[PDB]
Design a binder for this molecule. Sequence first.
Ligand SMILES: *[C@@H]1O[C@H](CO)[C@@H](O[C@@H]2O[C@H](CO)[C@@H](O[C@@H]3O[C@H](CO[C@H]4O[C@H](CO)[C@@H](O)[C@H](O)[C@@H]4O)[C@@H](O)[C@H](O[C@H]4O[C@H](CO)[C@@H](O)[C@H](O)[C@@H]4O)[C@@H]3O)[C@H](O)[C@H]2NC(C)=O)[C@H](O)[C@H]1NC(C)=O
Ligand SMILES: *[C@@H]1O[C@H](CO)[C@@H](O[C@@H]2O[C@H](CO)[C@@H](O[C@@H]3O[C@H](CO[C@H]4O[C@H](CO)[C@@H](O)[C@H](O)[C@@H]4O)[C@@H](O)[C@H](O[C@H]4O[C@H](CO)[C@@H](O)[C@H](O)[C@@H]4O)[C@@H]3O)[C@H](O)[C@H]2NC(C)=O)[C@H](O)[C@H]1NC(C)=O
Ligand SMILES: *[C@@H]1O[C@H](CO)[C@@H](O[C@@H]2O[C@H](CO)[C@@H](O[C@@H]3O[C@H](CO[C@H]4O[C@H](CO)[C@@H](O)[C@H](O)[C@@H]4O)[C@@H](O)[C@H](O[C@H]4O[C@H](CO)[C@@H](O)[C@H](O)[C@@H]4O)[C@@H]3O)[C@H](O)[C@H]2NC(C)=O)[C@H](O)[C@H]1NC(C)=O
Ligand SMILES: CC(=O)N[C@@H]1[C@@H](O[C@H]2O[C@@H](C)[C@@H](O)[C@@H](O)[C@@H]2O)[C@H](O[C@@H]2O[C@H](CO)[C@H](O)[C@H](O[C@]3(C(=O)O)C[C@H](O)[C@@H](NC(C)=O)[C@H]([C@H](O)[C@H](O)CO)O3)[C@H]2O)[C@@H](CO)O[C@H]1O
Ligand SMILES: CC(=O)N[C@@H]1[C@@H](O[C@H]2O[C@@H](C)[C@@H](O)[C@@H](O)[C@@H]2O)[C@H](O[C@@H]2O[C@H](CO)[C@H](O)[C@H](O[C@]3(C(=O)O)C[C@H](O)[C@@H](NC(C)=O)[C@H]([C@H](O)[C@H](O)CO)O3)[C@H]2O)[C@@H](CO)O[C@H]1O
Ligand SMILES: CC(=O)N[C@@H]1[C@@H](O[C@H]2O[C@@H](C)[C@@H](O)[C@@H](O)[C@@H]2O)[C@H](O[C@@H]2O[C@H](CO)[C@H](O)[C@H](O[C@]3(C(=O)O)C[C@H](O)[C@@H](NC(C)=O)[C@H]([C@H](O)[C@H](O)CO)O3)[C@H]2O)[C@@H](CO)O[C@H]1O
Ligand SMILES: *[C@@H]1O[C@H](CO)[C@@H](O[C@@H]2O[C@H](CO)[C@@H](O[C@@H]3O[C@H](CO)[C@@H](O)[C@H](O)[C@@H]3O)[C@H](O)[C@H]2NC(C)=O)[C@H](O)[C@H]1NC(C)=O
Ligand SMILES: *[C@@H]1O[C@H](CO)[C@@H](O[C@@H]2O[C@H](CO)[C@@H](O[C@@H]3O[C@H](CO)[C@@H](O)[C@H](O)[C@@H]3O)[C@H](O)[C@H]2NC(C)=O)[C@H](O)[C@H]1NC(C)=O
Ligand SMILES: *[C@@H]1O[C@H](CO)[C@@H](O[C@@H]2O[C@H](CO)[C@@H](O[C@@H]3O[C@H](CO)[C@@H](O)[C@H](O)[C@@H]3O)[C@H](O)[C@H]2NC(C)=O)[C@H](O)[C@H]1NC(C)=O
Ligand SMILES: *[C@@H]1O[C@H](CO)[C@@H](O[C@@H]2O[C@H](CO)[C@@H](O)[C@H](O)[C@H]2NC(C)=O)[C@H](O)[C@H]1NC(C)=O
Ligand SMILES: *[C@@H]1O[C@H](CO)[C@@H](O[C@@H]2O[C@H](CO)[C@@H](O)[C@H](O)[C@H]2NC(C)=O)[C@H](O)[C@H]1NC(C)=O
Ligand SMILES: *[C@@H]1O[C@H](CO)[C@@H](O)[C@H](O)[C@H]1NC(C)=O
Ligand SMILES: *[C@@H]1O[C@H](CO)[C@@H](O)[C@H](O)[C@H]1NC(C)=O
Ligand SMILES: *[C@@H]1O[C@H](CO)[C@@H](O)[C@H](O)[C@H]1NC(C)=O
Lengths: 319, 319, 319, 175, 175, 175
Amino acid sequence: NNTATLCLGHHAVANGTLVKTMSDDQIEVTNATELVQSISMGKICNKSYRILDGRNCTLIDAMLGDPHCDAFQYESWDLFIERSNAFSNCYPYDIPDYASLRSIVASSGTVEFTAEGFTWTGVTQNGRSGACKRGSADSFFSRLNWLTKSGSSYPTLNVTMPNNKNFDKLYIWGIHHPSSNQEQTKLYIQESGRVTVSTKRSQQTIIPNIGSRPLVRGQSGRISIYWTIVKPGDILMINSNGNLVAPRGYFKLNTGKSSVMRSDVPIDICVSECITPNGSISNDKPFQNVNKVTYGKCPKYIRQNTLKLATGMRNVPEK
Amino acid sequence: NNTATLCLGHHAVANGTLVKTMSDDQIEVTNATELVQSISMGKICNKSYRILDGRNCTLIDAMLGDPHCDAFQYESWDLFIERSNAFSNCYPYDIPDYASLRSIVASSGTVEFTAEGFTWTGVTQNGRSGACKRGSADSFFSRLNWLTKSGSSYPTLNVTMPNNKNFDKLYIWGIHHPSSNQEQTKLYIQESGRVTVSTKRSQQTIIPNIGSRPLVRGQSGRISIYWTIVKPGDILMINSNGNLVAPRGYFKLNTGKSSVMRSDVPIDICVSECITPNGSISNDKPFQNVNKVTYGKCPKYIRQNTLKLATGMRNVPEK
Amino acid sequence: NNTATLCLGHHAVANGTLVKTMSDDQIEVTNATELVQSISMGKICNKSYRILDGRNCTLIDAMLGDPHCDAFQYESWDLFIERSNAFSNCYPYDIPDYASLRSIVASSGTVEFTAEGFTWTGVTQNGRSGACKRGSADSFFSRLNWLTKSGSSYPTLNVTMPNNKNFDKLYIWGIHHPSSNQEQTKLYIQESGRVTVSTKRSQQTIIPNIGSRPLVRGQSGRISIYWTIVKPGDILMINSNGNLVAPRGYFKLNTGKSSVMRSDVPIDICVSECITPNGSISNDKPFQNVNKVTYGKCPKYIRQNTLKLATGMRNVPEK
Amino acid sequence: GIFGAIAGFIENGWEGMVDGWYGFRYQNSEGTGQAADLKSTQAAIDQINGKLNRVIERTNEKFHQIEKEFSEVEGRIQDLEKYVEDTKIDLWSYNAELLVALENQHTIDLTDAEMNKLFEKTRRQLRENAEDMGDGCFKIYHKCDNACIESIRTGTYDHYIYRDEALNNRFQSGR
Amino acid sequence: GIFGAIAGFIENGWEGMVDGWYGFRYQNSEGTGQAADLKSTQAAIDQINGKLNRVIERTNEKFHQIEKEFSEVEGRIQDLEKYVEDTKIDLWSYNAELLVALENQHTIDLTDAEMNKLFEKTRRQLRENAEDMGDGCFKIYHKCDNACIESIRTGTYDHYIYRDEALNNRFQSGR
Amino acid sequence: GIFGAIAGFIENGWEGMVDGWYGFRYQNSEGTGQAADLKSTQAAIDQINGKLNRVIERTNEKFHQIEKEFSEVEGRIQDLEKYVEDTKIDLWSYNAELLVALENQHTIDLTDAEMNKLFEKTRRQLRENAEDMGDGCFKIYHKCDNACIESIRTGTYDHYIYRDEALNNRFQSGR
Ligand SMILES: *[C@@H]1O[C@H](CO)[C@@H](O[C@@H]2O[C@H](CO)[C@@H](O[C@@H]3O[C@H](CO[C@H]4O[C@H](CO)[C@@H](O)[C@H](O)[C@@H]4O)[C@@H](O)[C@H](O[C@H]4O[C@H](CO)[C@@H](O)[C@H](O)[C@@H]4O)[C@@H]3O)[C@H](O)[C@H]2NC(C)=O)[C@H](O)[C@H]1NC(C)=O
Ligand SMILES: *[C@@H]1O[C@H](CO)[C@@H](O[C@@H]2O[C@H](CO)[C@@H](O[C@@H]3O[C@H](CO[C@H]4O[C@H](CO)[C@@H](O)[C@H](O)[C@@H]4O)[C@@H](O)[C@H](O[C@H]4O[C@H](CO)[C@@H](O)[C@H](O)[C@@H]4O)[C@@H]3O)[C@H](O)[C@H]2NC(C)=O)[C@H](O)[C@H]1NC(C)=O
Ligand SMILES: *[C@@H]1O[C@H](CO)[C@@H](O[C@@H]2O[C@H](CO)[C@@H](O[C@@H]3O[C@H](CO[C@H]4O[C@H](CO)[C@@H](O)[C@H](O)[C@@H]4O)[C@@H](O)[C@H](O[C@H]4O[C@H](CO)[C@@H](O)[C@H](O)[C@@H]4O)[C@@H]3O)[C@H](O)[C@H]2NC(C)=O)[C@H](O)[C@H]1NC(C)=O
Ligand SMILES: CC(=O)N[C@@H]1[C@@H](O[C@H]2O[C@@H](C)[C@@H](O)[C@@H](O)[C@@H]2O)[C@H](O[C@@H]2O[C@H](CO)[C@H](O)[C@H](O[C@]3(C(=O)O)C[C@H](O)[C@@H](NC(C)=O)[C@H]([C@H](O)[C@H](O)CO)O3)[C@H]2O)[C@@H](CO)O[C@H]1O
Ligand SMILES: CC(=O)N[C@@H]1[C@@H](O[C@H]2O[C@@H](C)[C@@H](O)[C@@H](O)[C@@H]2O)[C@H](O[C@@H]2O[C@H](CO)[C@H](O)[C@H](O[C@]3(C(=O)O)C[C@H](O)[C@@H](NC(C)=O)[C@H]([C@H](O)[C@H](O)CO)O3)[C@H]2O)[C@@H](CO)O[C@H]1O
Ligand SMILES: CC(=O)N[C@@H]1[C@@H](O[C@H]2O[C@@H](C)[C@@H](O)[C@@H](O)[C@@H]2O)[C@H](O[C@@H]2O[C@H](CO)[C@H](O)[C@H](O[C@]3(C(=O)O)C[C@H](O)[C@@H](NC(C)=O)[C@H]([C@H](O)[C@H](O)CO)O3)[C@H]2O)[C@@H](CO)O[C@H]1O
Ligand SMILES: *[C@@H]1O[C@H](CO)[C@@H](O[C@@H]2O[C@H](CO)[C@@H](O[C@@H]3O[C@H](CO)[C@@H](O)[C@H](O)[C@@H]3O)[C@H](O)[C@H]2NC(C)=O)[C@H](O)[C@H]1NC(C)=O
Ligand SMILES: *[C@@H]1O[C@H](CO)[C@@H](O[C@@H]2O[C@H](CO)[C@@H](O[C@@H]3O[C@H](CO)[C@@H](O)[C@H](O)[C@@H]3O)[C@H](O)[C@H]2NC(C)=O)[C@H](O)[C@H]1NC(C)=O
Ligand SMILES: *[C@@H]1O[C@H](CO)[C@@H](O[C@@H]2O[C@H](CO)[C@@H](O[C@@H]3O[C@H](CO)[C@@H](O)[C@H](O)[C@@H]3O)[C@H](O)[C@H]2NC(C)=O)[C@H](O)[C@H]1NC(C)=O
Ligand SMILES: *[C@@H]1O[C@H](CO)[C@@H](O[C@@H]2O[C@H](CO)[C@@H](O)[C@H](O)[C@H]2NC(C)=O)[C@H](O)[C@H]1NC(C)=O
Ligand SMILES: *[C@@H]1O[C@H](CO)[C@@H](O[C@@H]2O[C@H](CO)[C@@H](O)[C@H](O)[C@H]2NC(C)=O)[C@H](O)[C@H]1NC(C)=O
Ligand SMILES: *[C@@H]1O[C@H](CO)[C@@H](O)[C@H](O)[C@H]1NC(C)=O
Ligand SMILES: *[C@@H]1O[C@H](CO)[C@@H](O)[C@H](O)[C@H]1NC(C)=O
Ligand SMILES: *[C@@H]1O[C@H](CO)[C@@H](O)[C@H](O)[C@H]1NC(C)=O
């Protein structure tokens, strides 16, 4: 005609997708994005964090110095992976407050050891055991020194070691529980032993406990493991008349981004910034449904496996 | 006239009600709904969960086997109610880390006991006490065996019991603290006793502690109670030269929806899906102000006693 | 002309300010308000809460009765400030579960002591030490009584003290660890001592532990501190054949608004209702970035140092 | 309301409408009548129904937990248990307060929208054949019986039919 | 703004209005003048005042808590204490960020609404006696002195009075 | 939508617009054509892009924490560790659900706004020279070639130029 008509509109697409609003359970829009990461990578990426595969070793074992853990001797990590085939292979023990020690060491992020010159006067050092074979010879945890009677004497040990460095030292020590009074007196003159590890500000006395326990690698005796933090300027002191499993030096204690994770998933050559037991996961979404156990730069864990965020107007197809 | 007038409107009601928006503190709408449950039912509904009324008994007592708790012997529950008249009536005791044991047993949801054939060679079993009357005769906790000297001997007990089932066993045992060296030697030859309960992976030695405590039901002695979890394939081992209060078997440990609640409110014949100390409460609202202690399918507990959700347009009455 | 034109508008200002919306990262409005308190006052206001400056004393020390803490003897507080120059000056000790005792006393909000008439028959009382000088004479913690051998005897102490008041009593006691068997027998006849503090419902036996520790103010011995809550109607009982550091009475235990805070910032004459280690802070904003450690009526702590709330329309300047 | 319809240009509500949420009243050659508009009423109701179920998860089973009441004074651990719970309660309490304000605000606004949406729909149908009276009323410049009114309500109204007539009644004026 | 009034069809703000938030400027037979519209200004301000107090509880007393700084390395328990606090802070931090965005968005939108609401109110008063110029201005087709303008502002304006005259000035045209 | 434009007065979307989000189709003396309107498209997109980054903090490094899986049955402490985590997860889960609903609602509404804003902009340009057809179409009462249409799109359209002509074609009528 000799007059015009002008119409306004908006676009639509062929492949619309449903989202949820305050007003509707499901409503179609032109485009939506997933906000929840639910696919893992199936493997832990060796980059960008420093990953140490524990293999057959637990973290506690690698630091104590179980013979099959000797390879970890010099190691530090961002994240230490604890596998499930993981087992122990040295003298049987137990750590009262195990998890705490596990946590302290994990966040320290190293099993690196600095030997110190302790003097144990009039006692035989380096007690070894058939339960703890290095190669195929009797041995013991490498970071512990098993002291017994020399000749016919075990005199009151009274050894001292001041902290002159400007950091906290972590000392790991222990006590040995023999299986019979017969064994006790044999290895440690006195009928009843004890250990009093002390500083200027704390102290801990541990008494051994005679008796048979179930056989573990041929042995019915046991060892209990304890720790002590010595502050700069402070001073360590070990007093014992029997049963002491002595430290060989200290662990440097670090404040750091370090940790430990239980995982059976393999380690592979890729890059990523977030790790779960299920593997490394992608970083870009705000939420995540893979695992509540996470390390690194991770999206927040939530219960839902899917959440759609509208990134376009409402989709109204021809009709 | 010969022309029309057409008006648009919306409805109003006589009984409007005030709500809160982002823009107004109070504003009248056509209808509102309460979002907070603040009325309880005054009673605990015997359905739908399985409720066990502890009556005079605590949960710990029912499992240990206090004589007035004998009725609970065979019981399992979804929720065990602990009343306040609740009291003890057997030998005086204490459980170091009581709450933990209470929690472990509560979530297990049973006090059902499987007896095992333990052998205590050369000691008299079934030690009873005037403080723990079954009917009107001296007795003791039914799940514990109080061992004393036989003749003139209490030899080192060395008893074993492997876990061959495919679940964790829970073993409850104890030690007896006598009131005088006079009493100690009388019931247990040796001047100083001990108990070393052990598995392949853990161990606990407890030494008795001589001395007078305040009289409870005529007795000044005491008992301390301990537990031990034995894993499948693992093995229990009890080593004692005096003072051992022996287990009679195991408790099967369950993963379950079970729990315990402190309440004085009566139990009645009704139906509901959420329980608080104040009684069962209704399920349908999202929030709840009755009690922060809840069990079951419950609305979330909040501080406010009222919250109104508008379910109609703004109400504008004639004017 | 002979016809009019009427225009509608809104105001603008010269000094607009940027805010964040759902739709824009930065957008200018006519006025905005800060929602996060990030400036502290630099000092703790002596009003409105009751503040006690610990000065050279820790909270634990003031209650135990360290001689340089004698001034706190009669004190109660809303908030007790623990400084960092703070040091100890009495006999060397340690409290197993220190933090808990610190917390219990802090929330009680008093170190006020009620002496009781305990009878320690056939032992010398008031044992003093060169490490704990009152004025310039040997002394000891004022709330503890150090008992030793009288003549050639230390008989089994068996002292009792019922709670006849209608509140819980808190009793603080301890045990002494000597440095050598030589010292032990000298001060406490028996070779091995013990303490069994008990009520009708709980009990705790502590054995001393012989041995040398590092010198603190000339002394190598130590003291370990324990507590006991005695309920109304219940009864305290102390049984000891050596090494007991006896209580002199009780602390009244309060439910209250009281607490303790580590701060080095000075106390000054002002008014405020919220306190942080950095000083008192202002109350009026909803959020706060000064410190996560707060006491009183405080805004919630968040990570961001700034948050702007629009309090005017969008600002559109001439153009 | 953001749209100025409800409690604004529309003076007030009709208690006489026991019939629907939105509608019409009309005066014509056959008298005066009233009819509720269902689509509008439905659009609102649909948005308001199940409103809360689009944010709050259908309430969830929860069994054994932590203890939240205590007989003994313990310190450190009990301190933590009390704080964990206290934190949880305070955070949910915020959530609930904010949720109510958000939803109510939304509700108010969507109902004002539906009113406006319907007025606008009607205005657009009528074209220059009518007049916005300002109180949500249209002066219609032609004889409009019940079948005529009913057609505006169904959305079948044809203004080209009435254009000529409307113009006459409209442009009678001028001095 | 959702309404396209502020920073849209209304070109910009008036710094000259030290008087109110919304208003009029007019040119007539008596000259040019300016008047702030109080009801609009009040409606906005009322919504913006005490805004935050409709979501955030009046700040609450809190006394003894958990410890949040540590001298010693302890492990398990300290691990938990640090995580409880860290969780609490991160969750409140979210709350505060979202709250600000929500409120500001709402504020922006309600102020744009009030502007539009007022323009619309005025347009409706005038009827076919006027012309929407497009920049939030009305061409009024008749002699309109200050008493005339003032009446539009009070909401007392009567267009039936000016209809005839308006029509004349309007329909002078056609070629 | 609150504005009734998208999925309301505008019947439906144009799949043929591979060009922009909002625009025009026109029929004139030169034939029929289609042009996307960039400012509208841009205003929407700008609001939708980086939407979530205005609420959610750029994701943060987190290292050693608490344990969340357990081999042994321990009671009290493990009870607390499990509850702390469970609480954390449930609270974030709420946050995420509410956030999505809020954002989507906002998105829907701002896109409906931009459509309406553009229709309104165009209507205001045309004045009495045109007619609101009701389906988001304008009947233009004068010969309007592509340069004419293009001018309406640029915002340079002058109605005083076409007034006389429009009136003629408009007021041809009356019987
Ligand atoms: C308290 O009570 C406990 C349990 O009754 C005692 O502990 C047991 O002590 C006996 C020895 O006195 C142990 O017997 C030994 O068992 C070893 C382990 O066997 C396991 O593994 C092998 C595979 O290599 C399997 O056969 C089997 O599945 C077992 O699980 C054996 O290797 C030893 O074998 C040697 O002895 C035999 C028989 O005399 C010889 O012919 C062989 O050549 C070989 O040299 C041995 O038989 C028993 O295992 C211990 N049990 C536990 C649970 O520890 C304590 O001794 C007791 N304490 C006291 C009395 O103070
Ligand atoms: C360490 O020190 C404590 C406290 O001094 C001693 O423990 C007390 O020991 C005496 C006995 O030596 C106890 O006396 C007995 O008390 C019983 C409980 O009485 C309570 O209940 C009754 C109601 O039945 C009430 O009368 C009263 O309110 C009490 O609370 C009595 O039942 C006993 O009565 C018998 O003795 C009397 C008097 O000789 C006879 O005439 C009667 O016939 C009857 O048979 C008895 O008197 C006292 O209760 C203990 N106190 C506590 C707190 O335990 C330890 O003995 C001591 N340790 C040592 C020395 O090693
Ligand atoms: C187990 O092993 C430990 C460590 O080897 C022993 O503990 C040490 O015991 C000796 C004494 O046997 C202590 O020696 C004494 O040290 C005191 C502290 O000195 C500190 O402070 C002063 C400032 O006043 C500084 O000089 C210095 O920096 C020190 O840090 C001295 O004050 C004593 O001085 C007295 O003795 C000297 C020398 O004989 C006299 O000439 C003086 O006049 C004065 O009276 C004294 O020398 C030593 O400090 C202890 N060390 C620790 C770490 O405790 C245990 O004895 C041992 N246990 C056994 C054997 O059972
Ligand atoms: C059938 C028989 O009696 N054989 C003798 C054998 O008996 C024991 O075999 C061992 C493997 C155990 O299972 C035990 O239960 C059997 O009865 C003797 O073997 C030694 O037995 C002693 C004490 O009974 C120890 O068990 C010892 O173990 C070592 C070890 O760790 O391997 C030797 C270490 O050098 C020693 N380390 C020290 C002193 O530092 C330790 C340590 O003393 C204990 O572990 C502490 O708990 O013990 C077995 O080698 C042998 C030798 O006497 O004779 C067989 O005829
Ligand atoms: C006035 C007087 O001396 N009477 C004698 C009485 O003294 C005690 O009375 C009892 C009720 C206590 O309050 C006690 O403090 C009084 O001195 C004697 O009663 C026994 O006393 C002994 C030791 O002093 C025990 O208290 C014993 O208790 C039993 C019990 O539990 O009831 C008997 C049990 O069979 C026994 N169980 C065993 C061995 O397995 C226990 C157990 O030995 C202890 O509880 C362990 O701590 O003790 C009282 O019956 C009687 C009998 O000797 O003589 C009165 O003249
Ligand atoms: C060089 C030398 O041997 N000097 C003798 C001195 O030896 C000790 O000096 C003191 C300061 C210590 O550092 C010690 O290690 C030195 O060897 C003697 O000093 C006493 O030594 C004894 C035991 O060795 C105690 O250390 C005692 O300390 C007191 C104290 O606390 O000050 C005296 C108190 O009155 C006493 N309190 C009581 C009994 O209630 C305490 C208490 O017995 C212990 O602290 C418990 O652990 O000890 C020193 O005064 C003196 C005196 O014998 O002779 C010097 O020649
Ligand atoms: C509708 O939205 C979806 C998802 O929101 C669009 O896909 C996504 O688009 C983003 C933004 O450009 C992509 O980011 C890009 O990633 C690549 C490689 O990683 C990079 O080279 C670019 O510079 C940019 O950062 C993102 O990859 C992609 N999302 C997914 C899950 O694949 C989609 O294209 C949009 N659809 C339409 C029709 O507009
Ligand atoms: C305005 O809203 C209120 C509350 O939102 C209305 O009362 C409620 O209406 C609901 C929805 O129908 C009722 O649910 C019903 O419950 C019964 C029995 O439990 C069941 O048989 C039905 O099938 C349905 O599920 C609910 O009971 C009721 N709420 C309360 C607290 O009683 C009210 O009727 C509405 N008012 C108006 C004027 O519309
Ligand atoms: C724009 O808003 C800002 C901040 O929102 C305005 O400053 C603030 O105004 C409030 C409300 O009146 C002030 O409260 C007053 O405090 C004084 C003394 O404390 C008291 O005497 C009054 O009765 C009233 O409660 C508040 O002090 C003030 N905020 C700050 C941080 O100083 C500002 O004036 C507004 N600007 C414009 C141009 O409207
Ligand atoms: C709870 O305990 C009390 C006993 O202490 C029981 O009630 C008593 O019944 C006995 C007779 O059997 C009498 O001594 C009294 O008449 C009752 N005492 C009181 C205080 O009322 C009650 O039966 C016990 N409940 C159960 C389930 O055993
Ligand atoms: C806190 O402790 C120090 C003592 O260690 C006190 O300040 C000292 O005062 C004494 C004299 O009384 C002198 O040794 C020094 O002049 C001061 N020492 C220092 C390091 O400045 C101080 O008085 C104590 N505070 C209280 C409240 O007792
Ligand atoms: C991740 O591993 C857990 C066990 O740690 C397992 O239960 C779960 O199925 C895995 N999740 C995914 C998403 O693969
Ligand atoms: C529920 O019981 C508690 C004690 O557990 C009591 O303080 C409270 O008043 C009760 N609440 C209601 C709503 O009845
Ligand atoms: C407050 O004190 C802490 C140490 O407790 C310090 O790290 C921080 O810088 C201070 N904060 C402010 C805002 O001054």
